[PDB]
Each structure stands twice: as structure tokens, then as C-alpha cells.
Structure 1
């Protein structure tokens, strides 16, 4: 398929890595070959969340021109799921040229059905370089008006940049009695609501376990919502 999807947001801590990891496993479980990419250069967490904790070669090495991207592709314990991990040390962060993200990622298009890019939030250099490496964008936001409007702005930017905006995910819903309900959130976002991921301790547990909740705790509300999201993502093909 070769669909490159940028997982983005207007703010950090909204669930980008969580959505990237769970969606990857959900899609992989449906038989699709997935590459989870950690484009969050200053806060590499994706590989750890997928249980790959010891990679010697990372995207940072590739972006520094010190390694071929082929050598930064690792297996994960999940069927059909591979990862392009990021380094955590500052020296690696410094030497990774973010401007080379688009060319590096797109060169892998023919080897996967889905390439999900975990992006840092915002509109600064690293964020833009990562988001612009994708062809499609999945907006991730929380039930906060400020988070919604900020994420909306990112979507508009990406839309103008040429990316197909698939829609958005309303994550961490139910965390507070002040949360904006889905119907209203969609009315605000101006893009299709693809899934509501509830606030669920099971998701946090998966994060700490290094095994996405979608697989670690398959009967949790969070797991089931991600399975549905994966179904929706495939339909929008």
C-alpha cells in the first residue's frame, strides 16, 4: 500500500506516541505490514513503547548521514510491525538533520503498507520536518478547546502543504467532566472524527509495559477503540 501517515498534534502529551504504537499493532494484527517511525527527535519514546529497547542504530544516525536507513529498521515482538527507532542521547539529537526526514522516510514507501510517523507537536523545525514526511495526516487532540484549536491550525498548515487530512482522534475522553463531547469536538475540528479513545488506565499500563494496550489488555475500552480506529484508517484508503 505504501501509505505514509503523520500522527500529529497542536500540543504535546496528547497521545501521539500512544496512537502511533497502538494503531501500528492493531493494523499489524489485521495483516498489514507496518513501519512505526519515531520522528520525535528530541523525545524519542516510540521504540521503548514498542518493546525495542536496545537498538544500536537509529533514525538519528541516518539523519546524521552515518547510516543507511535500512540498518535502522528493527523487528518488534508484534506480527507485521517494524520500527525505525530514535536515539535518546543529546549528541544524537544534535547531529540529526531534521530536514532530511522527508527524503529518508519516503524512500521506504515501497516496503510497507503503512508507515506511521510519531511526530513532535507544534510547528517548529523538527515538528514540520516530521509531519511533512507524510502524505496523510491523522490529527490527535484532547477534549480541550485550546488543544482542539491548536491542532486544527496544524491540520490547516498540513492541508496547505499538500497532505490529505484523514480526520482526527479525540483522545483521553472522560478524563474530566469538562471534556468537550465528541459531536461538539468534531463540530470544532472541521474534520471527520475517526475515533474516540477514552481515558483508560489500561493504555497507561501498556505504555509502561512496553506492550501497547491494544494487545496487552485486548478487552479494555482503550484497546477496543484502537481496533476500531485501525478499521477506519483502512476504510479511508
Structure 2
């Protein structure tokens, strides 16, 4: 295949990393070879959430012209799920040219069915460099108003950029009484509502565990909701 999807959001604290990880494990669970990429150069976190603790070679090394991206790809405890991890030390952050992300990531378009990029929130250089590395985009958002709005903005900036907006994800729903319902928030974003990820403590349990919820606690609500998302994402092709 070769679908490079960018997991993005306009605000933050929305659950981009959670989505990237659970979705990855979900797709890989359906026989799809997937590469989870950590595009948050300033605060690497994706690999940790995926159980890959101390990688020697990271995306930062590659973006610094220090290593070939092929040596920054690691196996994870999950089937068909590989990760392109990011370093955390400051020096690495500095020497990592975010502008090379698109060329680096797209050079992997033929070795995976899906390349899911975890993108840092915002429109700054790092965020932009990351989001603009994908061909498709998955908007992640919370049932908040200021959130649903910004995220929507970002959707267009990327649509104008040439990325195909696949739709959004309403994450954390059922967290508050004042949470915007589904269809409502749907005819607001103005893009298909691909899935509703409930506020489930199980998702947080998976995070700390280093084993995405969809796999760690299979029967949980969050787990099932992500498996469906997997189906919805696959259908879009």
C-alpha cells in the first residue's frame, strides 16, 4: 500500500499520541504492516507509549544527517507494528532539521501499508514540518468548542496544502456534561465523523503500561472503539 496518514489536532491534550498508538496496533492486528512515526521532535513520547524504551538510533539522528532512516526503524511487541522513534535529549532536538521530515518519511512509502505520523499541536515549524509529511490527515479533537474550531482550521490549512482530509475523531466524549454530542460536532467540523473514542480510564492504563489499550484491555469500550476506527480508516480506500 503506502498510505501516509498524519495524526493531527489544532489544540493539544486531545490524544494524538493515543490515537497514533492504538490505531497502529489496531491496523497491525488486521495484518497491515504499520510504521508508527514520532513527529513531535520537541517532546518525543510515541515510542514509550509503544513499549520501545531505549532506542540507540532515532528520527532525530536521521534529521541530523547522522543516520539512514532504515536504521531508525524498530520492532515493537506488537505484530506488524514498527516504530520510527524520537530522541528526548535536548542536543538531539537542536540538531534535528524538521524540514527534512517530508523527504525522510515519504521515502518509506513503499515499505508499509500505513505510516502514521504523531504530530505536535500547533502551526509552528516542527508541527507544520510533521503534518506536511503526510498525504492523508486524521483530525483528532475533544468535545470542546474552542477545540473543535481550531482543529477545523488546521484541517483546511492541510487541505490547501494538498493533503486529503479523511475526517476527524471525537476523542474523550462522555467526559463532561457539557460535551458536544456526535452529529452536532459533526456538522460543525464539516468532515465525516470517523469515530467516537469515549473517556475510558483503560486508555490511560494502556498509556502508562506501554501497551496501547486496544490490545492491553481488548474488551474495554475504548479498545472496541479503536478497532472500529481501524475498520473505518481501511474502508476509505
Band of TM-score, shorter chain: over 0.9
Counterpart-to-counterpart distance in 2, 1:128 and 1:15? 18
- Offset from partner CA, 1:66-97 (integer Å, 9 cap, x none): 00000000000000000000001111111100
**Rounded Cα–Cα distance in structure 1 between residues aligned with 2:188 and 2:41:** 30
Q: Compute the displacement of 1:11 (Å).
A: 1.1
Shift of 1:235: 0.1
SS at match of 2:83: strand
Q: How far 1:126 sits from its partner (Å)?
A: 0.4
Return the alpha-carbon distance in structure 2 between the equivalents of residues 12 and 100 of structure 1: 24
Deviations along 1:181-210, whole A, 9 cap, x unmatched?
011110110000000000000000000000
1:103-142 aligned within 5 A: 103-142=103-142
**Residue in 2 that maps onto 1:209:** 209
Counterparts of 1:154 and 1:60, CA distance in 2: 25
Following the alignment from structure 1 to structure 2, what is the Cα–Cα distance between the partners of residues 112 and 219? Answer: 28
Local SS of the residue matching 1:202: helix
1:171 pairs with 2:183? no
Q: CA deviation at 1:24?
A: 0.2
The alpha carbon displacement at 1:135 in A equals 0.2
Deviations 1:87-126 (A, max 9, x none): 0111111110000000000000000000000000111100
Shift of the alpha carbon at 1:161?
Answer: 0.2
**TM-score, with structure 1 as normaliser:** 1.00
CA-atom RMSD in angstroms: 0.4
Mapped partners of 2:104, 2:221: distance in 1: 36
- For residues 190 and 97 of structure 2, the distance between their equivalents in structure 1, rounded to whole angstroms, comes to 34
Aligned residues: 237
Q: What CA deviation, in whole Å up to 9, does each residue of 1:47-78 have, x standing for no partner?
A: 00000001010000000110000000000000
Give the secondary structure class of the aligned counterpart of 2:110.
helix
- Where structure 1 has 5 or more consecutive residues not aligned to the other structure, the ranges are none
1:223 & 1:150 partners in 2: Cα distance? 27
State the Cα distance separating 1:19 from its structure 2 match.
Answer: 0.1
The separation in 2 between residues aligned to 1:91 and 1:219, in whole angstroms, is: 42
Give the TM-score of the pair, scaled to structure 2.
1.00
Deviation per residue, 1:165-185 (Å, 9 max, x gap) = 000000000111010001111
Runs of 4+ in 1 over 6 A off after TM superposition: none
